[PDB]
Design a protein around this ligand. Structure first.
Ligand SMILES: [Mg+2]
Ligand SMILES: [Mg+2]
Ligand SMILES: [Mg+2]
Ligand SMILES: [Mg+2]
Ligand SMILES: [Mg+2]
Ligand SMILES: [Mg+2]
Ligand SMILES: [Mg+2]
Ligand SMILES: [Mg+2]
Ligand SMILES: [Mg+2]
Ligand SMILES: [Mg+2]
Ligand SMILES: [Mg+2]
Ligand SMILES: [Mg+2]
Ligand SMILES: [Mg+2]
Ligand SMILES: [Mg+2]
Ligand SMILES: [Mg+2]
Ligand SMILES: [Mg+2]
Ligand SMILES: [Mg+2]
Ligand SMILES: [Mg+2]
Ligand SMILES: [Mg+2]
Ligand SMILES: [Mg+2]
Ligand SMILES: [Mg+2]
Lengths: 51, 136, 117, 177, 76
RNA sequence: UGCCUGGCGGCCGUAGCGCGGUGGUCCCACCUGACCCCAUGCCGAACUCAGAAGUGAAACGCCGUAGCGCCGAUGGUAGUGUGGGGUCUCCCCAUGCGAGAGUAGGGAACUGCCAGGCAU
RNA sequence: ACUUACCAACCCGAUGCAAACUGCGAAUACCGGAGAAUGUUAUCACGGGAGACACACGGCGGGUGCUAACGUCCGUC
RNA sequence: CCUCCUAAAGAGUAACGGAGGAGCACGAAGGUUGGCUAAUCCUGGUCGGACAUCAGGAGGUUAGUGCAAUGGCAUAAGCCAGCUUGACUGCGAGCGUGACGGCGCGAGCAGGUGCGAAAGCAGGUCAUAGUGAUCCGGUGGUUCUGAAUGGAAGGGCCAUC
């Protein structure tokens, strides 16, 4: 609704990315979470990018 | 004219009026007017009968009304087809099973209570009987 | 809630999970004056091994019955008695008390003595 | 520490002989002293609550707890979770050090002081009283105080009755009427 | 305002009654809350569905101080 | 073997609540102290540690007590599957099932494992 | 602050009412196990060929309507 | 599309029958470890009142649950804090529910992770609404394909709009 789709991209260099939504008004800072990368088979840091 | 002050819901399913009455004993006064029939008493019928018996005892003694018209009755007006939602509430009835003590009285001699009840009974759509208080 | 009832409430979830897993549990009880330990079978109605400071044989070699040193003694005692009956794998039940101080001292002693948890 | 010693050596002695208790543990004890500042007007000016907190912290030597609104009420125009006051629970040394400072130097400095009420007991021994000016406490500086505030003082006791609760405070020579 | 609406029936209720032989994984009861609680060899799903954790016979029982309903699986 | 107490269960109000009485050697509790381990959106209240001057006041356990909860027949009543019938909005008969409420009455739990104190 | 031929929630005792109330609770029905007798497999699977998807009245249980309709809408025979 | 009743004590069951709600929210309002327990009434208390905050008693979940209803919820699913990313990737015994397309529940296995001393718990949120098939096209990745051959375009496959 007032909530936008965002992609979390792998820092491991692999093109792999997770997909989620974000309330861009209330939380303007880029989302950072450690998630499992199935290409490097390890838990790496993921950073927000535009969908 | 008796009626619930507020209700959980406006309208109610028709339902049925099977079974024998609960509250078949003179529990507050000395005499009672018991229903022998099965039917509905409208708030207007209840009031009409209450007025008749009150005038009869010349507003001496004490009267109890053991029935309450808590059932909403709907009705579709003229020139209205079937369906298009349930009708509007017009009046309130009390379901009456054989045995219900409708009215109770005390503070008046038996002969007078008998007459007052004879007068009220004529305003009711169901057959009644005079009842006296009992020891158990 | 009063101290006891509040403690039983705190203990209920873990005890129900242990019941569910059908685990042999090392149940610890603590009091200002004494510390107790029981190894109860999964059914919960029978004790396999026990040790405490109310026991003449243990209290004799201790300064005060209600301190961390006494707790470490009770801990060493249950594990030794449990291992003599072949009981090796257990699950610790802190019984509403914090896993700290006396309770911790008892559990670290039982772990040292050879009990597996 | 002074009045706790006075309790042990002289108050217990006085109460035991007054009510004829079978045990010393029956003797009413001062359980806790609770100081409270109902700000209320903090909803308009948020800074006002902070000054009430800094005032209470000087009176009783411990960090106050800023109490929030338990439920929303239209009458006072407050929503659930609003900082609408601050309290302090006094126990042990700090309760006694405060209780002496109250009887000895604070309560005598009340404007035209003749004696506090002895009928303000909750029916179960606990005593409730309210100060109008916070400048009665010598820990507060008249030159630095932004506004004149008041607070609630409640002495929670182990007394079962008001008769018992009265006797426990009177034995500390609490300035009554 | 106007009525006329209702949702699809969710087909909840008891799927396997007392005594029925079930293989591990079989749903015993689909429910909204925990009308029945998971007992021995019975798991509880995210939508409070009770399922078999082991092959055996479905057993219904009333246990505890709160007199609650429990579904368990007895070995056959 | 008996009495008392603590722990962990079975059972889940015939087991609970109230009222009266009662217990501290041991156990349990309150309790004493708090710098520290650890703790408080404040507070050693709680959590926690180091203890033993005091008390069974509270709590807790035990004993008593039908004010309340709770359990609860028998008989009748209500309903109802099948077959039949009437004056068919509602009933009745044959047969099988048979409540709920109320009544008499019951009732101040019962029980297992381990440990500790005391006594013979 | 004092007081009144008024009204009066809660609480206690007494008396009823409920599709969207339940500290109770059937008869039936339904699911599962075992067993006999009976029944031209009545059962299940796969494959060939369909028709049919305007129903009606009567009984029982209901909604709607006026417990109006040879009314209307479900269930079940 | 979701919830309750009608609905005849398994499921299902109609009407322009009776009542309401959804077309979102949340990086914490998710995970875990540790802790905590409401509503309402009576009594007392500076300003302060029927109702703000404080204390005691009764009460015992009637409160609360981001939102409708119903079922749940104290071992809390309710409320707080510390650390955190399991709002994991591949799979999946066995089930439920559908004419179908589908939709749902799921222990367990592998890799990797968070929390906890540990047993363990975590594949989002108490549960049940919060939604859009296919085609065509866009973006990123790719041991695939690549119309003489090597490339390339385009196509496929995985992710996503
Ligand atoms: Mg202490
Ligand atoms: Mg006592
Ligand atoms: Mg019988
Ligand atoms: Mg029965
Ligand atoms: Mg009965
Ligand atoms: Mg009864
Ligand atoms: Mg008796
Ligand atoms: Mg012994
Ligand atoms: Mg076929
Ligand atoms: Mg058609
Ligand atoms: Mg048709
Ligand atoms: Mg038809
Ligand atoms: Mg017709
Ligand atoms: Mg059904
Ligand atoms: Mg049915
Ligand atoms: Mg939540
Ligand atoms: Mg927890
Ligand atoms: Mg007040
Ligand atoms: Mg670890
Ligand atoms: Mg070419
Ligand atoms: Mg080529």
């Amino acid at each position: 609704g007032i909530r936008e789709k965002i992609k979390l991209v792998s820092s491991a260099g692999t093109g792999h990315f997770y997909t989620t939504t974000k309330n861009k008004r209330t939380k303007p800072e880029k989302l950072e979470l450690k998630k499992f990368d199935p290409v490097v088979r390890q838990h790496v840091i993921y950073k927000e990018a535009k969908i | 004219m008796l009626q619930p002050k507020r209700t959980k819901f406006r309208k109610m399913h028709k339902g049925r009026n099977r079974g024998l009455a609960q509250g078949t004993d003179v529990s507050f006064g000395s005499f009672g007017l018991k229903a022998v029939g099965r039917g509905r008493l409208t708030a207007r019928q209840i009031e009409a009968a209450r007025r008749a018996m009150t005038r009869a005892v010349k507003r001496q003694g004490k009267i109890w009304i053991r029935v309450f018209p808590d059932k909403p009755i709907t009705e579709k007006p003229l020139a209205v087809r079937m369906g298009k939602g349930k009708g509007n509430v017009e009046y309130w009835v009390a379901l009456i099973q054989p045995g219900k003590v409708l009215y109770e009285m005390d503070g008046v001699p038996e002969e007078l209570a008998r007459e007052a009840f004879k007068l009220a009974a004529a305003k009711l759509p169901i057959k009644t009987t005079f009842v006296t208080k009992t020891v158990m | 809630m009063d101290k006891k009832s509040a403690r039983i409430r705190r203990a209920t979830r873990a005890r129900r999970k242990l019941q569910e897993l059908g685990a042999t549990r090392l149940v610890v009880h603590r009091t200002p004056r004494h510390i107790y330990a029981q190894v109860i079978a999964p059914n919960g109605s029978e004790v396999l091994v026990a040790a405490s400071t109310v026991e003449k044989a243990i209290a004799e070699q201790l300064k005060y019955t209600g301190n961390k040193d006494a707790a470490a003694a009770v801990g060493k005692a249950v594990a030794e008695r449990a291992l003599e009956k072949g009981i090796k794998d257990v699950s610790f039940d802190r019984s509403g008390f914090q896993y700290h101080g006396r309770v911790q001292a008892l559990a670290d002693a039982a772990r040292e003595a050879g009990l597996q948890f | 520490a002074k009045l706790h010693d006075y309790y042990k050596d002289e108050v217990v002695k006085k109460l035991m002989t007054e009510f004829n208790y079978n045990s010393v543990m029956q003797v009413p004890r001062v359980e806790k002293i609770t100081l409270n500042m109902g700000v209320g007007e903090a909803i308009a000016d948020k800074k006002l609550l902070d000054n009430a907190a800094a005032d209470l912290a000087a009176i009783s030597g411990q960090k106050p707890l800023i109490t929030k609104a338990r439920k929303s009420v239209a009458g006072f125009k407050i929503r659930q979770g609003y900082p609408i006051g601050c309290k302090v629970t006094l126990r042990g040394e700090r309760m006694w050090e405060f209780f002496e400072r109250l009887i000895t130097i604070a309560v005598p400095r009340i404007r035209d002081f003749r004696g506090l009420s002895a009928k303000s007991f909750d029916g179960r021994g606990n005593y409730s009283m309210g100060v109008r000016e916070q400048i009665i406490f010598p820990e507060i500086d008249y030159d630095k105080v932004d506004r004149v505030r008041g607070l609630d003082i409640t002495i929670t006791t182990t007394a079962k009755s008001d008769e018992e609760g009265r006797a426990l405070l009177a034995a500390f020579d609490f300035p009554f009427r | 305002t106007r009525n006329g609406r209702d949702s699809e029936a969710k087909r909840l209720g008891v799927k396997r009654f007392g005594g029925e032989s079930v293989l591990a994984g079989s749903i015993i009861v689909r429910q909204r809350g925990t009308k029945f609680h998971a007992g021995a060899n019975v798991g509880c799903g995210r939508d409070h569905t009770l399922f078999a954790k082991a092959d055996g016979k479905v057993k219904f029982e009333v246990k505890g101080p709160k007199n609650r309903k429990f579904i368990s699986i007895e070995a056959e």
